[PDB]
Amino acid sequence: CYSSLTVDYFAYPLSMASYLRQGSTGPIAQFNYKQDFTNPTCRILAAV
Amino acid sequence: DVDLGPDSTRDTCDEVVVQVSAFQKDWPQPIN
Amino acid sequence: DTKVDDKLGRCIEYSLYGVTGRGVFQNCTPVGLKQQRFVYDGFDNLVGY
Amino acid sequence: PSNVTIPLPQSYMWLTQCYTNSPSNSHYVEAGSYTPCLGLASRGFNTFN
Amino acid sequence: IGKHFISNYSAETLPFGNGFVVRIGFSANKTGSLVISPSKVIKKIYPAFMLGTAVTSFAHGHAGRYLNHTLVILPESCGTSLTVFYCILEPRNGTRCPNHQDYTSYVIWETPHSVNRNATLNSFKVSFNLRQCKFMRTYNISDDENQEWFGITQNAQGVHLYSSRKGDLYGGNMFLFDTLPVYETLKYYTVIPRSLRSRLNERQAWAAFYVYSLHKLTYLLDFSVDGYVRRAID
Amino acid sequence: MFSSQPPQVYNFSRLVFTNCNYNLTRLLSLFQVSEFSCHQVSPSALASG
Ligand SMILES: *[C@@H]1O[C@H](CO)[C@@H](O[C@@H]2O[C@H](CO)[C@@H](O[C@@H]3O[C@H](CO)[C@@H](O)[C@H](O)[C@@H]3O)[C@H](O)[C@H]2NC(C)=O)[C@H](O)[C@H]1NC(C)=O
Ligand SMILES: *[C@@H]1O[C@H](CO)[C@@H](O[C@@H]2O[C@H](CO)[C@@H](O[C@@H]3O[C@H](CO)[C@@H](O)[C@H](O)[C@@H]3O)[C@H](O)[C@H]2NC(C)=O)[C@H](O)[C@H]1NC(C)=O
Ligand SMILES: *[C@@H]1O[C@H](CO)[C@@H](O[C@@H]2O[C@H](CO)[C@@H](O)[C@H](O)[C@H]2NC(C)=O)[C@H](O)[C@H]1NC(C)=O
Ligand SMILES: *[C@@H]1O[C@H](CO)[C@@H](O[C@@H]2O[C@H](CO)[C@@H](O)[C@H](O)[C@H]2NC(C)=O)[C@H](O)[C@H]1NC(C)=O
Ligand SMILES: *[C@@H]1O[C@H](CO)[C@@H](O[C@@H]2O[C@H](CO)[C@@H](O)[C@H](O)[C@H]2NC(C)=O)[C@H](O)[C@H]1NC(C)=O
Ligand SMILES: CCCCC/C=C\C/C=C\CCCCCCCC(=O)O
Ligand SMILES: *[C@@H]1O[C@H](CO)[C@@H](O)[C@H](O)[C@H]1NC(C)=O
Ligand SMILES: *[C@@H]1O[C@H](CO)[C@@H](O)[C@H](O)[C@H]1NC(C)=O
Ligand SMILES: *[C@@H]1O[C@H](CO)[C@@H](O)[C@H](O)[C@H]1NC(C)=O
Ligand SMILES: *[C@@H]1O[C@H](CO)[C@@H](O)[C@H](O)[C@H]1NC(C)=O
Ligand SMILES: *[C@@H]1O[C@H](CO)[C@@H](O)[C@H](O)[C@H]1NC(C)=O
């Protein structure tokens, strides 16, 4: 169990999975979404 | 590939004397 | 490009030909080699420029 | 993505073995160096070869 | 002018190892006897080298043939310019050329008598054919009679050339002046024989140069106030 | 890198750059990166320093 749970979700193509990884310098990490690492966090890429 | 000029038009290479005993002389220069 | 003739004597950030850091700048007599552009100490720290 | 950025080679080729006489005397590439079998591998690897 | 008087510096393929340093111009103001006539004021001569990765024999069993791309370093303009090029050398089949029975050694030469600035390269082209050359670079050297130092090392970033003339013209400290895009590991080097076809009224004595191998060692360098190294400990 | 066809893995080509500025965004916009793995550095640090 944990005190809070925050989920950030968006439509993202699986061909650009390397642009969502930490340290990346592509357009996604520079102008779209940078993952915050202050809290214990996990990033999940999936298909429906 | 960089162009390094025309090939040598000569058909004969020069003639050389290979003497080694004349060049055997020592002026030692060790690394100090 | 910014100049150092104003920011002498106080802690400033520098980016000198790609070498980055922070320090205090002061006009000094030249030591070391001019062509190498950087003077270091025995602990691999920039002590001159 | 675009075939006009870089010309397309014919195929992807790589070395599977490189040895002298017997496979037990294999020559391994070093870190950041070229293989000893570079001249042999320059002839290419295809369906026939 | 007679036949060239050379030693057997060809066919002597020493291992490159970690590179080497060359002491150039020692005893460039004293007097010494001529080798061909065992005396005059000695002068400084520059070495010419030939570096590669593979070696073999020539067409008739004579050693000293460099295969594939070969790094060649040649002084030019009578010791004024230095030219470095990276080509594949094709031996020629003349009467005395390497791919012929009457072959003992190859030599480069300069005729002292408006500088052509290409005589050494032409003398080299007499013996070899130059094909698929990757790069050619040129450097200026101011002619003097001071003792100099030249060195070569190879690394993952290419071939590094060190000269004393960059920072310490009157000292022995050696500074990098160019980096060559030679990334295949050099394994052999030879000193190319050099001759001067000067007349009896223009003959001179040329100073010996010394080649020392380089090793991965720790040194204790003493840096002066002006930044030069004047004392070291192995 | 763009003039001719790329070589094979056993015959890799090497480019060394010194004393120059390169447009990294233009270089990265021509490739669809699928996987990267850095050591003792990060791509953001390569683009920032
Ligand atoms: C460095 O130079 C040597 C030459 O001394 C190169 O070796 C030569 O490479 C060529 C091309 O692969 C070989 O030609 C081939 O011969 C076979 C028959 O054996 C033939 O079927 C092919 O169609 C082709 O013509 C040549 O035989 C070979 N010679 C020797 C003595 O090995 C070597 O490849 C060069 N190194 C590099 C990295 O390029
Ligand atoms: C062979 O003799 C020549 C004679 O010219 C020597 O060249 C001279 O070498 C001295 C020092 O070895 C040079 O003096 C230096 O001058 C600079 C200013 O240019 C000064 O800042 C230095 O402190 C030093 O005094 C001199 O310039 C130079 N002259 C020429 C024309 O090159 C040469 O060194 C001798 N080679 C030997 C002994 O191996
Ligand atoms: C000395 O010879 C070299 C070739 O061995 C010349 O360099 C090439 O010359 C041709 C003919 O003009 C040019 O097409 C090439 O572009 C030159 N290649 C270079 C410069 O890398 C060189 O020009 C000759 N020197 C003189 C003064 O003519
Ligand atoms: C490694 O790859 C390079 C480039 O793909 C090859 O260089 C080409 O070689 C051929 C003949 O050997 C030349 O006609 C081309 O002009 C060269 N191109 C370039 C860009 O250099 C090289 O031969 C390959 N090496 C091996 C051992 O296969
Ligand atoms: C680096 O390359 C980018 C292209 O990826 C350049 O961006 C172009 O800039 C010009 C003028 O600023 C615009 O007209 C183009 O539309 C831009 N292209 C794209 C794809 O956006 C950029 O100018 C180059 N230089 C620098 C310093 O970033
Ligand atoms: C496309 C790679 C080759 C481009 C040209 C060569 C070298 C450029 C040098 C350094 C930049 C490294 C960027 C790291 C890319 C992974 C991160 C991403 O972008 O997700
Ligand atoms: C820095 O010091 C040098 C030598 O003392 C002097 O020539 C120069 O004018 C000084 N510059 C400034 C900005 O003080
Ligand atoms: C790239 O592919 C397209 C797809 O049809 C083709 O029309 C074009 O000619 C190709 N370009 C090259 C340089 O091969
Ligand atoms: C060159 O001459 C010396 C002097 O005798 C000799 O020791 C050496 O073996 C010779 N080199 C070759 C390749 O024969
Ligand atoms: C001599 O060499 C040239 C080119 O290197 C070649 O065209 C010619 O056939 C050779 N001659 C002989 C007799 O081998
Ligand atoms: C020196 O280099 C220049 C090019 O930088 C060249 O034109 C010249 O011929 C060289 N030699 C001399 C003696 O100036």
CSV table of N, CA, C and O in Angstrom, one decimal, chain E residues 70-160:
chain,number,residue,atom,x,y,z
E,70,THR,N,49.7,2.6,-46.9
E,70,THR,CA,50.9,2.8,-46.2
E,70,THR,C,51.1,4.3,-45.9
E,70,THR,O,50.8,5.2,-46.8
E,71,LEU,N,51.4,4.6,-44.7
E,71,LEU,CA,51.7,6.0,-44.2
E,71,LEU,C,53.1,6.4,-44.5
E,71,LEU,O,54.0,5.8,-44.0
E,72,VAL,N,53.3,7.4,-45.4
E,72,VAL,CA,54.6,7.8,-45.8
E,72,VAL,C,54.8,9.3,-45.4
E,72,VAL,O,54.0,10.1,-45.7
E,73,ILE,N,56.0,9.5,-44.7
E,73,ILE,CA,56.3,10.9,-44.2
E,73,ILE,C,57.6,11.3,-44.9
E,73,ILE,O,58.6,10.6,-44.8
E,74,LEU,N,57.6,12.4,-45.7
E,74,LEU,CA,58.7,12.8,-46.5
E,74,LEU,C,59.0,14.2,-46.3
E,74,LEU,O,58.1,15.1,-46.4
E,75,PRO,N,60.3,14.6,-46.0
E,75,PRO,CA,60.7,16.0,-46.1
E,75,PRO,C,60.7,16.5,-47.5
E,75,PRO,O,60.9,15.7,-48.5
E,76,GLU,N,60.5,17.8,-47.7
E,76,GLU,CA,60.4,18.3,-49.1
E,76,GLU,C,61.0,19.7,-49.1
E,76,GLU,O,61.2,20.3,-48.0
E,77,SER,N,61.2,20.2,-50.3
E,77,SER,CA,61.8,21.6,-50.5
E,77,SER,C,63.1,21.8,-49.8
E,77,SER,O,63.4,22.8,-49.3
E,78,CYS,N,64.0,20.7,-49.9
E,78,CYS,CA,65.3,20.7,-49.3
E,78,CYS,C,65.2,21.0,-47.8
E,78,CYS,O,65.9,21.9,-47.3
E,79,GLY,N,64.4,20.3,-47.1
E,79,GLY,CA,64.2,20.4,-45.7
E,79,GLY,C,63.4,21.6,-45.2
E,79,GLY,O,63.5,22.0,-44.1
E,80,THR,N,62.6,22.2,-46.1
E,80,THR,CA,61.7,23.3,-45.8
E,80,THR,C,60.3,22.9,-45.5
E,80,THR,O,59.7,23.4,-44.6
E,81,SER,N,59.8,21.9,-46.3
E,81,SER,CA,58.4,21.5,-46.1
E,81,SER,C,58.4,20.0,-45.7
E,81,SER,O,59.3,19.3,-46.0
E,82,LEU,N,57.3,19.6,-45.1
E,82,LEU,CA,57.0,18.2,-44.7
E,82,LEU,C,55.7,17.8,-45.3
E,82,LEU,O,54.7,18.5,-45.1
E,83,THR,N,55.7,16.7,-46.1
E,83,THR,CA,54.5,16.2,-46.7
E,83,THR,C,54.2,14.8,-46.2
E,83,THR,O,55.1,14.0,-46.1
E,84,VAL,N,52.9,14.6,-45.8
E,84,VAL,CA,52.5,13.3,-45.3
E,84,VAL,C,51.3,12.8,-46.1
E,84,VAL,O,50.4,13.6,-46.4
E,85,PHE,N,51.4,11.6,-46.6
E,85,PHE,CA,50.3,11.0,-47.4
E,85,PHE,C,50.1,9.6,-47.1
E,85,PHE,O,50.9,8.9,-46.5
E,86,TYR,N,48.9,9.1,-47.5
E,86,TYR,CA,48.4,7.7,-47.1
E,86,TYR,C,47.9,7.1,-48.3
E,86,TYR,O,46.7,7.3,-48.7
E,87,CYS,N,48.7,6.2,-49.0
E,87,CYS,CA,48.4,5.6,-50.2
E,87,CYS,C,48.7,4.1,-50.2
E,87,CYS,O,49.3,3.6,-49.2
E,88,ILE,N,48.3,3.4,-51.3
E,88,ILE,CA,48.7,2.0,-51.5
E,88,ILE,C,49.8,2.1,-52.6
E,88,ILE,O,49.7,2.6,-53.7
E,89,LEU,N,51.0,1.5,-52.2
E,89,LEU,CA,52.2,1.6,-53.1
E,89,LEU,C,52.2,0.4,-54.0
E,89,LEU,O,52.2,-0.7,-53.6
E,90,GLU,N,52.3,0.7,-55.3
E,90,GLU,CA,52.4,-0.3,-56.3
E,90,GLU,C,53.8,-0.3,-56.9
E,90,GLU,O,54.2,0.6,-57.5
E,91,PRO,N,54.6,-1.4,-56.6
E,91,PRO,CA,56.0,-1.4,-57.2
E,91,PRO,C,56.0,-1.4,-58.7
E,91,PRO,O,55.1,-2.0,-59.3
E,92,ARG,N,57.0,-0.8,-59.2
E,92,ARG,CA,57.2,-0.7,-60.7
E,92,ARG,C,58.2,-1.7,-61.2
E,92,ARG,O,59.0,-2.3,-60.4
E,93,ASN,N,58.1,-2.0,-62.5
E,93,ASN,CA,58.9,-3.1,-63.1
E,93,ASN,C,59.9,-2.5,-64.1
E,93,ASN,O,60.1,-3.1,-65.2
E,94,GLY,N,60.6,-1.5,-63.7
E,94,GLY,CA,61.7,-1.0,-64.5
E,94,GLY,C,62.9,-1.8,-64.5
E,94,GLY,O,62.9,-3.0,-64.0
E,95,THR,N,64.0,-1.3,-65.0
E,95,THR,CA,65.3,-2.1,-65.0
E,95,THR,C,65.8,-2.3,-63.6
E,95,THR,O,66.4,-3.3,-63.3
E,96,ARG,N,65.7,-1.2,-62.8
E,96,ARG,CA,66.3,-1.3,-61.4
E,96,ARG,C,65.2,-1.1,-60.4
E,96,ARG,O,65.5,-1.0,-59.2
E,97,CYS,N,63.9,-1.1,-60.8
E,97,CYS,CA,62.8,-0.8,-59.9
E,97,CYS,C,62.5,-2.1,-59.1
E,97,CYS,O,62.9,-3.2,-59.4
E,98,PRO,N,61.7,-1.9,-58.0
E,98,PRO,CA,61.5,-3.1,-57.1
E,98,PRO,C,61.0,-4.4,-57.7
E,98,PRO,O,61.3,-5.5,-57.3
E,99,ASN,N,60.1,-4.3,-58.7
E,99,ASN,CA,59.5,-5.5,-59.3
E,99,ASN,C,60.4,-5.9,-60.5
E,99,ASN,O,60.0,-5.9,-61.7
E,100,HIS,N,61.7,-6.1,-60.2
E,100,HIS,CA,62.6,-6.5,-61.3
E,100,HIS,C,63.8,-7.1,-60.6
E,100,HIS,O,64.2,-6.8,-59.5
E,101,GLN,N,64.5,-7.9,-61.4
E,101,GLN,CA,65.6,-8.7,-60.8
E,101,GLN,C,66.8,-7.8,-60.3
E,101,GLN,O,67.4,-8.1,-59.3
E,102,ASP,N,67.1,-6.8,-61.1
E,102,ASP,CA,68.2,-5.9,-60.7
E,102,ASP,C,67.6,-4.9,-59.7
E,102,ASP,O,67.4,-3.8,-60.1
E,103,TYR,N,67.4,-5.4,-58.5
E,103,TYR,CA,66.8,-4.5,-57.5
E,103,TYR,C,67.5,-4.8,-56.2
E,103,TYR,O,67.6,-5.9,-55.7
E,104,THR,N,68.1,-3.8,-55.5
E,104,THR,CA,68.7,-3.9,-54.2
E,104,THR,C,68.0,-3.1,-53.2
E,104,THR,O,67.7,-3.5,-52.1
E,105,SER,N,67.7,-1.8,-53.5
E,105,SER,CA,67.0,-0.9,-52.5
E,105,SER,C,66.3,0.2,-53.3
E,105,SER,O,66.7,0.5,-54.5
E,106,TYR,N,65.4,0.8,-52.6
E,106,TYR,CA,64.8,2.1,-53.1
E,106,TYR,C,65.3,3.2,-52.3
E,106,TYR,O,65.7,3.1,-51.2
E,107,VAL,N,65.4,4.4,-53.0
E,107,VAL,CA,65.9,5.6,-52.4
E,107,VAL,C,65.2,6.8,-52.9
E,107,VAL,O,64.6,6.8,-54.0
E,108,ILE,N,65.1,7.8,-52.0
E,108,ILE,CA,64.6,9.2,-52.4
E,108,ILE,C,65.8,10.1,-52.4
E,108,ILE,O,66.8,9.9,-51.7
E,109,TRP,N,65.7,11.1,-53.2
E,109,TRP,CA,66.9,12.0,-53.4
E,109,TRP,C,66.4,13.4,-53.8
E,109,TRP,O,65.2,13.6,-54.2
E,110,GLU,N,67.2,14.4,-53.5
E,110,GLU,CA,67.0,15.8,-53.9
E,110,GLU,C,68.2,16.4,-54.6
E,110,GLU,O,69.3,16.2,-54.1
E,111,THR,N,68.0,17.0,-55.7
E,111,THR,CA,69.1,17.7,-56.4
E,111,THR,C,69.2,19.1,-55.8
E,111,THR,O,68.2,19.9,-56.0
E,112,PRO,N,70.3,19.5,-55.2
E,112,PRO,CA,70.4,20.9,-54.7
E,112,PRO,C,70.4,22.0,-55.8
E,112,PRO,O,69.9,23.1,-55.6
E,113,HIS,N,70.9,21.6,-57.0
E,113,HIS,CA,70.8,22.5,-58.1
E,113,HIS,C,69.8,22.0,-59.2
E,113,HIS,O,68.7,22.6,-59.3
E,114,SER,N,63.9,29.7,-57.1
E,114,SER,CA,62.7,29.0,-57.4
E,114,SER,C,62.8,27.5,-57.0
E,114,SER,O,63.3,26.8,-57.9
E,115,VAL,N,62.3,27.1,-55.9
E,115,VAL,CA,62.4,25.8,-55.4
E,115,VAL,C,61.2,25.0,-56.1
E,115,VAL,O,60.1,25.5,-56.2
E,116,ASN,N,61.5,23.8,-56.6
E,116,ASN,CA,60.5,22.9,-57.2
E,116,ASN,C,59.5,22.5,-56.2
E,116,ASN,O,58.3,22.4,-56.5
E,117,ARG,N,59.9,22.2,-54.9
E,117,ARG,CA,59.0,21.8,-53.8
E,117,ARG,C,58.3,20.5,-54.1
E,117,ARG,O,57.4,20.1,-53.4
E,118,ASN,N,58.8,19.7,-55.1
E,118,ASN,CA,58.2,18.4,-55.4
E,118,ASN,C,59.3,17.4,-55.8
E,118,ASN,O,58.9,16.3,-56.3
E,119,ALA,N,60.6,17.7,-55.6
E,119,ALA,CA,61.6,16.8,-56.0
E,119,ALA,C,61.6,15.5,-55.3
E,119,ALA,O,61.8,14.4,-55.8
E,120,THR,N,61.4,15.5,-53.9
E,120,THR,CA,61.4,14.3,-53.1
E,120,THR,C,60.2,13.4,-53.5
E,120,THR,O,60.4,12.2,-53.6
E,121,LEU,N,59.1,14.0,-53.8
E,121,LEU,CA,57.9,13.2,-54.2
E,121,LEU,C,58.1,12.6,-55.6
E,121,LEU,O,57.7,11.4,-55.8
E,122,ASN,N,58.7,13.3,-56.5
E,122,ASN,CA,59.0,12.8,-57.8
E,122,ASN,C,60.0,11.6,-57.7
E,122,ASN,O,59.9,10.6,-58.4
E,123,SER,N,61.1,11.8,-56.8
E,123,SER,CA,62.0,10.7,-56.6
E,123,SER,C,61.4,9.5,-56.0
E,123,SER,O,61.7,8.3,-56.3
E,124,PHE,N,60.4,9.7,-55.1
E,124,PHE,CA,59.6,8.6,-54.6
E,124,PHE,C,58.7,7.9,-55.7
E,124,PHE,O,58.6,6.7,-55.7
E,125,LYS,N,58.1,8.7,-56.5
E,125,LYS,CA,57.3,8.2,-57.6
E,125,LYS,C,58.1,7.4,-58.6
E,125,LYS,O,57.5,6.6,-59.4
E,126,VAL,N,59.4,7.7,-58.7
E,126,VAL,CA,60.2,6.9,-59.6
E,126,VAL,C,60.2,5.4,-59.2
E,126,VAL,O,60.2,4.6,-60.1
E,127,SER,N,60.2,5.2,-57.9
E,127,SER,CA,60.2,3.8,-57.5
E,127,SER,C,58.9,3.1,-57.2
E,127,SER,O,58.7,1.9,-57.4
E,128,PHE,N,57.9,3.9,-56.8
E,128,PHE,CA,56.6,3.4,-56.5
E,128,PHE,C,55.5,4.1,-57.2
E,128,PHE,O,55.6,5.2,-57.7
E,129,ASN,N,54.3,3.4,-57.4
E,129,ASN,CA,53.1,4.0,-57.9
E,129,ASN,C,52.2,4.3,-56.8
E,129,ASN,O,52.0,3.5,-55.8
E,130,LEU,N,51.5,5.4,-56.8
E,130,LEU,CA,50.6,5.9,-55.7
E,130,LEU,C,49.2,5.8,-56.1
E,130,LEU,O,48.7,6.5,-57.0
E,131,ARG,N,48.4,4.9,-55.5
E,131,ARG,CA,47.1,4.6,-55.9
E,131,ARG,C,46.1,4.7,-54.7
E,131,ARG,O,46.5,4.3,-53.6
E,132,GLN,N,44.9,5.2,-54.9
E,132,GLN,CA,43.9,5.3,-53.9
E,132,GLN,C,44.3,6.0,-52.6
E,132,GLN,O,44.2,5.6,-51.5
E,133,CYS,N,44.9,7.2,-52.8
E,133,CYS,CA,45.4,8.0,-51.7
E,133,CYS,C,44.3,8.6,-51.0
E,133,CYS,O,43.4,9.3,-51.6
E,134,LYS,N,44.3,8.5,-49.7
E,134,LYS,CA,43.2,9.0,-48.8
E,134,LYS,C,43.4,10.5,-48.5
E,134,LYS,O,42.5,11.3,-48.8
E,135,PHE,N,44.6,10.9,-48.0
E,135,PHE,CA,44.8,12.3,-47.7
E,135,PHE,C,46.3,12.6,-48.0
E,135,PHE,O,47.1,11.7,-48.1
E,136,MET,N,46.5,13.9,-48.2
E,136,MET,CA,47.9,14.4,-48.3
E,136,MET,C,47.9,15.8,-47.6
E,136,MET,O,47.0,16.6,-47.8
E,137,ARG,N,48.8,16.0,-46.7
E,137,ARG,CA,48.9,17.2,-45.8
E,137,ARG,C,50.3,17.7,-45.9
E,137,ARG,O,51.3,17.0,-46.1
E,138,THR,N,50.5,19.0,-45.8
E,138,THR,CA,51.8,19.7,-45.9
E,138,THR,C,52.0,20.6,-44.7
E,138,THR,O,51.0,21.2,-44.1
E,139,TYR,N,53.2,20.7,-44.3
E,139,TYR,CA,53.6,21.6,-43.2
E,139,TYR,C,54.8,22.4,-43.5
E,139,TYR,O,55.7,21.8,-44.2
E,140,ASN,N,54.9,23.6,-43.0
E,140,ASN,CA,56.1,24.4,-43.2
E,140,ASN,C,57.1,24.2,-42.0
E,140,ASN,O,56.7,24.1,-40.9
E,141,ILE,N,58.4,24.2,-42.4
E,141,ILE,CA,59.4,24.1,-41.4
E,141,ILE,C,60.4,25.3,-41.7
E,141,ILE,O,61.0,25.3,-42.8
E,142,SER,N,60.6,26.2,-40.7
E,142,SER,CA,61.7,27.2,-40.9
E,142,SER,C,63.0,26.6,-40.7
E,142,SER,O,63.3,25.9,-39.7
E,143,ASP,N,63.9,26.7,-41.7
E,143,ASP,CA,65.2,26.1,-41.8
E,143,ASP,C,66.1,26.8,-40.8
E,143,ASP,O,66.4,28.0,-40.9
E,144,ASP,N,66.7,26.0,-39.9
E,144,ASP,CA,67.7,26.5,-38.9
E,144,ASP,C,68.7,25.4,-38.7
E,144,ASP,O,68.7,24.4,-39.4
E,145,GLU,N,69.5,25.5,-37.6
E,145,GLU,CA,70.4,24.4,-37.2
E,145,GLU,C,70.3,24.0,-35.8
E,145,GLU,O,71.3,23.6,-35.2
E,146,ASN,N,69.1,24.2,-35.2
E,146,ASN,CA,68.8,23.8,-33.8
E,146,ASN,C,68.5,22.3,-33.8
E,146,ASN,O,67.9,21.7,-34.7
E,147,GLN,N,68.8,21.7,-32.6
E,147,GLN,CA,68.4,20.3,-32.4
E,147,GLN,C,66.9,20.2,-32.1
E,147,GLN,O,66.3,21.0,-31.3
E,148,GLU,N,66.3,19.3,-32.8
E,148,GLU,CA,64.8,19.2,-32.8
E,148,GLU,C,64.4,17.8,-32.4
E,148,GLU,O,65.3,16.9,-32.2
E,149,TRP,N,63.2,17.6,-32.1
E,149,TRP,CA,62.6,16.3,-31.7
E,149,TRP,C,61.3,16.1,-32.4
E,149,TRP,O,60.5,17.0,-32.5
E,150,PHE,N,61.1,14.9,-33.0
E,150,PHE,CA,59.9,14.5,-33.7
E,150,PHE,C,59.4,13.2,-33.2
E,150,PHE,O,60.2,12.3,-32.9
E,151,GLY,N,58.1,13.0,-33.1
E,151,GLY,CA,57.6,11.8,-32.6
E,151,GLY,C,56.2,11.4,-33.2
E,151,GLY,O,55.5,12.3,-33.8
E,152,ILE,N,55.9,10.2,-33.2
E,152,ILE,CA,54.6,9.6,-33.7
E,152,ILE,C,54.1,8.6,-32.7
E,152,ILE,O,54.8,7.8,-32.1
E,153,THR,N,52.7,8.7,-32.5
E,153,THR,CA,52.0,7.7,-31.7
E,153,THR,C,50.7,7.4,-32.4
E,153,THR,O,50.2,8.3,-33.2
E,154,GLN,N,50.2,6.3,-32.2
E,154,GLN,CA,48.8,5.9,-32.7
E,154,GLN,C,47.9,5.6,-31.6
E,154,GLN,O,48.3,5.1,-30.5
E,155,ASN,N,46.6,5.9,-31.8
E,155,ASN,CA,45.6,5.9,-30.8
E,155,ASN,C,44.3,5.6,-31.5
E,155,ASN,O,44.2,5.5,-32.7
E,156,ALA,N,43.2,5.4,-30.7
E,156,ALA,CA,41.9,5.3,-31.2
E,156,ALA,C,41.4,6.5,-32.0
E,156,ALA,O,40.5,6.3,-32.9
E,157,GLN,N,42.0,7.7,-31.8
E,157,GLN,CA,41.6,8.9,-32.5
E,157,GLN,C,42.5,9.1,-33.7
E,157,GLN,O,42.4,10.1,-34.4
E,158,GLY,N,43.4,8.2,-34.0
E,158,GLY,CA,44.3,8.3,-35.2
E,158,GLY,C,45.8,8.3,-34.9
E,158,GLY,O,46.2,7.9,-33.8
E,159,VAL,N,46.5,8.9,-35.8
E,159,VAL,CA,48.0,9.0,-35.7
E,159,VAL,C,48.3,10.4,-35.3
E,159,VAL,O,47.9,11.4,-35.9
E,160,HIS,N,49.0,10.6,-34.2
E,160,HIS,CA,49.4,11.9,-33.6
E,160,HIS,C,50.8,12.2,-33.9
E,160,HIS,O,51.7,11.3,-33.7
